[PDB]
């Protein structure tokens, strides 16, 4: 199956003289393997997966230097945007950057992306062709004009089609025994009464990797999403995930409802019915 | 288009410090990353460090760590480079370069360079001696004569023959640094042997730092 | 730091030739390499960024290739304007820049033997207290020339300096001058001063010498 490597960056400014809080994480699929935190004592990029510790001091030094560079760039951009918006120096503002690449089963590049945000709103993103920018507001349009002048799209395209894919392939090779594992969910159904005439059926999916799953309810074969409650997938804490879906059903009609679980680790989609 | 203009050449004694400016015209010094590169005479390029002027965040090479202070002033659009504890090995042309990025990358815009001569010698005018043609300096109907410009400081001296009248066949060699801290060079020109007894050759040596102009006849 | 190795340090080519310059990194720098052109007395000019992309205004004969540890700068048809020194720079780490040693591209021509002239020290410098003997190697190619000083058939070591001109703009030759610095007492101690010049263009070494005090 396809694989993805993603990096997530966050820089939050502080009203006091303290430097902005910068934290970065790296993901291969849904597995974290690196972190950088400015409030950490070490002030170095730290391993978060067993398979990334095979890397060398050269790797860790390069990553730490690049993290510090990114932190200072975000520090500059926070001030630039604050000056643009004439915002008070006593406020706290956030810059978020996410970028990465996708590769296929053969390991060749599929797609790459890069998106920037300021205070939770879209600021500037790289188009699918990796050759243009989409601006969400006028400050973004200023940045877009400058970047179209100075080759930012080409630099990002080079990184994504090069180094991102190479790193993803190397990380997959080094940690296949965990990164190339599909864990099917352990599924069971629970019955929670509400009233004498009403009840709730809840379909569970526990301990599955990767996080992409589809829990759906059907009444006598007809898909219905009117009384369906679906929580967002949550991490179990050990690399696996959990999810559940609920339907409010009348009492005595439990046998009419079925739960369908589609996951890439399952050979064929399941069908659970309440006994 | 952004242009970087640097300060003039500095002659410094060992142990002193030199501050080299770099003014950005047509733009701001904060719209990019200013790098500082030096090149010793006849040697390759060497990266000293840089600064992100918008946050005043600087980086230095391990070789120059503890000696170079790179600072930028957005009010005047100038990036400075101060190198302390100067020694003779610091004699180089220092360049400021800009990248249109937050981090140092392919340097597209460069400054004209500043020459820092770290020498203990004092400003001294040249001594121009003649290199007289003779039978040993005549080969195939051509005779070679010239002037030896010796013991001057600092660079440069401009040597011209007959006030620019004789430019064909003139070889002014690069000045070599002697063991005494001073310089020396020779300017030789080849002329026909039949013109020795009828033509007068005078070498014009001009040294601006010492305000010395010497016209010696060979 | 990532050390960049350039090869060759010097390249001789004629107008219309295909020139290849190789830059090698100590570790994988990816595509983050930049090529520069520098001429004497001028700042470097950026030619190629990201190891393959030409800068605006750079002629199409320049081309870069390679990713990882091996890189190449190619000039398809060498022009007179392309004779300069080329440096490769790596920017794979955000705050670490390393340049290569540099490759000087010089004009190739036929071998020309130097014309060796030797000048005795002038009377004025003898009055001043020092003696300088100048040996001239004029209009030769290639650059590799060996000059040795023999004082009464005794070899001298450590009392001479050589200066070479850049290639001439008409005949693309070189010129060299070796100056022998001696104290006046040492100059008057000996009698025969000789300059022996060994070059590819000479069938046998050429020695031009003068006798002290004889007009």
């Amino acid at each position: 199956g396809s694989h993805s490597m993603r990096y997530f960056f966050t820089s939050v400014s502080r009203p006091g003289r303290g430097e902005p809080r910068f934290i970065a994480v790296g993901y291969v699929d849904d597995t974290q393997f690196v972190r950088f935190d400015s409030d950490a004592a070490s002030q170095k990029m730290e391993p978060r997966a067993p398979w990334i510790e095979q890397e060398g001091p050269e790797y860790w030094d390069q990553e730490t230097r690049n993290m510090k560079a990114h932190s200072q760039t975000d520090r500059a951009n926070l001030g630039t945007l604050r000056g643009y918006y004439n915002q008070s120096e006593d406020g706290s503002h956030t810059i978020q950057i996410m970028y990465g690449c996708d590769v296929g089963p053969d390991g060749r590049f599929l797609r790459g992306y890069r998106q920037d945000a300021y205070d939770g709103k879209d600021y500037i993103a790289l188009n699918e062709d990796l050759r243009s920018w989409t601006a969400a507001d006028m400050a973004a349009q200023i940045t877009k004009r400058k970047w179209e002048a100075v080759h930012a799209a080409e630099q990002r395209r080079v990184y994504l089609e090069g180094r991102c894919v190479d790193g993803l392939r190397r990380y997959l090779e080094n940690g296949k025994e965990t990164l190339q594992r599909t864990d099917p969910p352990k599924t069971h159904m629970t019955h929670h009464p509400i009233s004498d005439h009403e009840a709730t059926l809840r379909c569970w999916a526990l301990g599955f990797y990767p996080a992409e799953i589809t829990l759906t309810w059907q009444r006598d074969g007809e898909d219905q999403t009117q009384d369906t409650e679906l929580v967002e997938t949550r991490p179990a804490g050990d690399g696996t995930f959990q999810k559940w879906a609920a339907v409010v059903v009348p009492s005595g009609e439990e046998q009419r409802y079925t739960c369908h679980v589609q996951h890439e680790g399952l050979p064929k989609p399941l069908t659970l019915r309440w006994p | 288009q952004v242009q970087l203009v640097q300060s003039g050449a500095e002659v410094k004694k060992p142990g002193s410090s030199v501050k080299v400016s770099c003014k950005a015209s047509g733009g701001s010094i904060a719209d990019g990353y200013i790098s500082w590169v030096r090149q010793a005479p006849g040697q390759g390029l060497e990266w000293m460090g840089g600064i992100l002027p918008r946050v005043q965040y600087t980086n230095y090479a391990q070789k120059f760590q503890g000696r170079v202070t790179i600072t930028a002033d957005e009010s005047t659009s100038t990036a400075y480079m101060e190198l302390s504890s100067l020694r003779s090995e610091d004699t180089a042309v220092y360049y400021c370069a800009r990248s249109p990025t937050a981090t140092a990358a392919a340097l597209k815009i460069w400054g004209q360079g500043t020459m820092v001569t770290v020498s203990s010698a004092s400003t001294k005018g040249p001594s121009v001696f003649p290199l007289a043609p003779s039978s040993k300096s005549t080969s195939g109907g051509t005779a070679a004569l010239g002037c030896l410009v010796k013991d001057y400081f600092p660079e440069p001296v401009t040597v011209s023959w007959n006030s620019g009248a004789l430019t064909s066949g003139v070889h002014t060699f690069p000045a070599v640094l002697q063991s005494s801290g001073l310089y020396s060079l020779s300017s030789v020109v080849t002329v026909p042997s039949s013109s020795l007894g009828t033509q007068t050759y005078i070498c014009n040596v001009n040294h601006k730092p010492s305000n010395t102009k010497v016209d010696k006849k060979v | 730091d990532i050390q960049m190795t350039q090869s060759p340090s010097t390249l001789s080519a004629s107008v219309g030739d295909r020139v290849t310059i190789t830059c090698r990194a100590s570790r994988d720098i990816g595509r983050y390499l930049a090529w520069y052109q520098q001429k004497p007395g001028k700042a470097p000019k950026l030619l190629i960024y990201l190891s393959s992309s030409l800068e605006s205004g750079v002629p199409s004969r320049f081309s870069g290739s390679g990713s990882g540890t091996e890189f190449t700068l190619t000039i398809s048809s060498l022009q007179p304007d392309d004779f300069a020194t080329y440096y490769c720079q790596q920017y794979s780490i955000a705050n670490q820049l390393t340049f290569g040693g540099g490759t000087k591209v010089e004009i190739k021509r036929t071998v020309a033997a130097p014309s060796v002239f030797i000048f005795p020290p002038s009377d004025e410098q003898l009055k001043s207290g020092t003696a300088s003997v100048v040996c001239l190697l004029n209009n030769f190619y290639p650059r590799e020339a060996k000059v040795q000083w023999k004082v009464d058939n005794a070899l001298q070591s450590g009392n001479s300096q050589e200066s070479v001109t850049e290639q001439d703009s008409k005949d693309s030759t070189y010129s060299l001058s070796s100056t022998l610095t001696l104290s006046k007492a040492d100059y008057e101690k000996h009698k025969v001063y000789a300059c022996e010049v060994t070059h590819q263009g000479l069938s046998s070494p050429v020695t031009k010498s003068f006798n002290r005090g004889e007009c």
Partner: peptide, 9 residues
């Protein structure tokens, strides 16, 4: 790995 090029606004 991490992109070593940063851009300004």
């Amino acid at each position: 790995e991490v992109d070593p090029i940063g851009h300004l606004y």
